Amino acid sequence: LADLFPGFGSEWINTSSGRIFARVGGDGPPLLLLHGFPQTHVMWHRVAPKLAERFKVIVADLPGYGWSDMPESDEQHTPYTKRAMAKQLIEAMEQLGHVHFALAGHDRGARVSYRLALDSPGRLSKLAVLDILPTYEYWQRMNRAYALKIYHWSFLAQPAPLPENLLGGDPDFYVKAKLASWTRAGDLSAFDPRAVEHYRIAFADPMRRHVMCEDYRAGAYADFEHDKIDVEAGNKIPVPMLALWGASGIAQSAATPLDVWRKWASDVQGAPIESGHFLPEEAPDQTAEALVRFFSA
Amino acid sequence: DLADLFPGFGSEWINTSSGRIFARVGGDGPPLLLLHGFPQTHVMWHRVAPKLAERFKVIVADLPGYGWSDMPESDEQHTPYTKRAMAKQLIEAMEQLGHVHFALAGHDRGARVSYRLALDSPGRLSKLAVLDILPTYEYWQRMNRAYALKIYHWSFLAQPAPLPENLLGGDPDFYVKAKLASWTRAGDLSAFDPRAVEHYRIAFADPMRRHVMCEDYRAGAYADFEHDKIDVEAGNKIPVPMLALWGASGIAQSAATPLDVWRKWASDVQGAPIESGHFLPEEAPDQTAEALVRFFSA
Ligand SMILES: [Ca+2]
């Protein structure tokens, strides 16, 4: 497996919920980058060096993903709720001495990120979320067209071992299908093949796949419930935040992303990037430039 | 190796322009077509068909592309697996038997064929029974978080090929048993005759059969929905007397009445809950049989 972050250190950060793996590079204010599904930290390999010129970039595998330890789940999928994940990452950052840091997340990592910002906003200087709406918003907009487009939200949330048994027949196909289907081009051409290798190898582990389903089960239940409480209480993210989304991406599929985030965040700017879901790999220059400018503010 | 679950029923291969329909045929009297759904075959009727055969010529057919019926080759619009096309094929199949006016009971996908038949060609039907469904349009209009999780397979199997095909191939035995078990009231396979499960398992083991089922669900997400939508917007109602049976723990029920929903679609509909999960004729065979005999006799 290729090192896609030449010059970046490698940290195994111990937490009470297991070790967080992270590539660490650059200097300056701490910036935590969180990948999503079905990826690992290496999806930032095209934008992290650019950020590393101005920030201490911490590129972490989510709890349960990539090389991070996999906390044993439970009946409520607790360790893979975004609330628990955010707690674990806060702990991880504290092990490095970062108690106040900037955060950019994509996909599942973006969900950890806004949940972190709701639960523990004092930990965040600024927050960027890439190609998501809040989990609550996806579910609330889950009509026919949206159920078809993000079917995996209900499929991977099915009780164990139903998704796991089906994914186990041909894990390579599924990880490649999900990568391809959500690019602007609809194929794997936006990805570095050595990165695809990282994604493929992570997905080949049956426990890693279970964890991804657990993440999606949390996404269907506890994560939804946590968000529901916040939106129905009018709890807004007080951290300055950037919402970036792909013009051909998931977030814009069933809502105007900046409109939705303005319901969730008191101080949100948004920009579309010509790209599918995988902004940091499909449109690395445009994404890194948006992130550098936002976080330099 | 595959048990004959319809003692006294013959077997017909009925020729249609789109391929052969397989059916078990038993009884005498008015013709009654029974249509299974997913992921079953005609054998799901094995506990109630003998009851109905006391009073009716019971024709227990595998849907087009299901079971032992031929699989017409699909196209870009999944046309042969739309309920409209399936209904046209079964209308032709019944015509081959001299049945141009018949009673009809369908469960699951077969109930979808059945009410679409009733909408398109109401004069073909004396009476209609639908087991544990709402119209396809209604499922999609009610698509929310809760329903998306419950009938996830409606969007999963409608994914463009070969995504569900490939995943279904990962563990087809588990999948069909899981679908059967998870929609019963018990949550296991104890409601089913093990010889019936063997039929469902063996049908599900053929990748071509699984592909057809996905085509059926692709139709269910697209053409089928659009056909239903037109009838909704035109105010077209099913005019044949209709019986809607649903499991108290089935798919059709939720918070609002299945019967209140069917009244929007049919002008003459009666409805009863059955203590049952989704698979009324196997989970509650005599309560289902009694409801069907009482209704179809009139
Ligand atoms: Ca297996």
Curated annotation (Swiss-Prot), chain B:
Catalytic activity entry: a haloacetate + H2O = a halide anion + glycolate + H(+); fluoroacetate + H2O = fluoride + glycolate + H(+); chloroacetate + H2O = glycolate + chloride + H(+)
A molecular function GO annotation: haloacetate dehalogenase activity
Listed result of changing residue 278 to N: Abolishes hydrolysis of covalent reaction intermediate
A Pfam cross-reference name: Abhydrolase_1
Location of the active site: 108 (nucleophile), 278 (proton acceptor)
Site (Important for enzyme activity): 132
Amino acids binding fluoroacetate: 109, 112, 153-154, 217
Outcome of mutating residue 38 to A: Reduced catalytic rate. Minor effect on substrate affinity
Entry keywords, A to Z: Hydrolase
Stretches assigned to the AB hydrolase-1 domain: 30-268
Top enzyme category: hydrolase
Top-rank lineage group of the source organism: Bacteria
Known EC number: 3.8.1.3
Chain's role: Catalyzes the hydrolytic defluorination of fluoroacetate to produce glycolate. Has lower activity towards chloroacetate and bromoacetate.
PANTHER family in the record: EPOXIDE HYDROLASE
Family assignment from sequence similarity: Belongs to the AB hydrolase superfamily. Epoxide hydrolase family.
Subunit structure: Homodimer.
Protein name: Fluoroacetate dehalogenase
Species whose genome carries this gene: Rhodopseudomonas palustris (strain ATCC BAA-98 / CGA009)
